[PDB]
Structures are given as structure tokens and as C-alpha cells.
């Protein structure tokens, strides 16, 4: 029972997947590339999404769609087996759909 934001940030380093319809190798590759994006540029998040979907653009699919953020809402139409929603760093969260 920690007693501030800061001890929460001390514990919260895990990257829990909130909900996901992805293959296990799909999941591990996408999960690790997103954590490397978030650790690479905490300040400017635009070019995190640059890197995430352009890697997924050349490799996995011609269409892709990345949303990183702090507080937001969304409703998308997505073709099944290709959706990733994860919580990174105990605060920042990323939606990702094709």
C-alpha cells in the first residue's frame, strides 16, 4: 500500500497488455518495439508513432494506425486479429490497429 505517485512509479515498470488479439510472436515483437519507442523518446511522442508504424508499414502491413498518449478516448473499426492496447510505464498508453 504505497502512499504517493512516486512509489507507484517505482513499482510500475511492467508493460501490461490491456486487451489484445494478436499471435504470440506478433505480440512479443509488437510489444517490444513499442517499449523501445517509448523509452527512446519520452518527450516528443509524434516521432515515436513515426517509428512504430513505419516499421510496421514496411514489414507487416500496408495500412497501420498508432495512437500513443496520456488521456484520451477512441472508437475505431479494425479488422480482427490485429489489435494491441497496452499500458507502458504505468502512465502512457498506446492503441494500435490496422
Amino acid at each position: 500500500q504505497f502512499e504517493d505517485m512516486e512509489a507507484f512509479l517505482r513499482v510500475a515498470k511492467y508493460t501490461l497488455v490491456k486487451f489484445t488479439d494478436m499471435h504470440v510472436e506478433m505480440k512479443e515483437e509488437a510489444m517490444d518495439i513499442c517499449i523501445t519507442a517509448v523509452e527512446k523518446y519520452p518527450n516528443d511522442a509524434e516521432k515515436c508513432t513515426q517509428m512504430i508504424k513505419d516499421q510496421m508499414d514496411k514489414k507487416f502491413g500496408a495500412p497501420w494506425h498508432v495512437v500513443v498518449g496520456k488521456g484520451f478516448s477512441y472508437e475505431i473499426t479494425y479488422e480482427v486479429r490485429n489489435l494491441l492496447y497496452i499500458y507502458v510505464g504505468g502512465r502512457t498508453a498506446v492503441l494500435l490497429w490496422k
Binding site: 511522442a45 509524434e46 515515436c48 508513432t49 513515426q50 512504430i52 508504424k53 513505419d54 495500412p63 497501420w64 494506425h65 498508432v66 495512437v67 500513443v68 498518449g69 496520456k70 488521456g71 484520451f72 478516448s73 477512441y74 472508437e75 475505431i76 473499426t77
Partner: protein, 82 residues
Amino acid sequence: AVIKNADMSEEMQADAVDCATQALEKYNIEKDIAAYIKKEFDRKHNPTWHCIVGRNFGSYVTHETKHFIYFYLGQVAILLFK
């Protein structure tokens, strides 16, 4: 209303703004806002849209030639596209 970036026909930009503002006036939660803004425009013009509502979000997305709109109302942000 405030628009920061868009590349689409203004005659339905007016459609976008009048669709979003009455939505923001009516409901009192921000999931149903992004629900309605897609839903009613979806039954208006095209089969496919995607729409984001919040504050301090980052995104990269492939544009559409005449379907890409980035609103701004009252420190509450909206994106929608095809």
C-alpha cells in the same frame, strides 16, 4: 471552433463541425462523443471512419486524400478520418 490541420472539402468541413459541436453539447462523457462523431457521419457519407477524442494524445496515421480532420474545441481534441 478551432481547426489545426485538415485536407478535405470545406462544404463537409461544416458538416464535421456541426456534427461534433452538438455531440459535445449533448453528451456528458467522452467515449460516447467518439461514438457519435463516427456513427452519425458514417450514416451520412461513407462506410469507414475513425475518430479520437481526448487531451494530450500522439498519433501517426495514414491520411486519406480528402478525409482527414483535426479539430480543437475548448481544450478538448477531436480527430477523424477514413
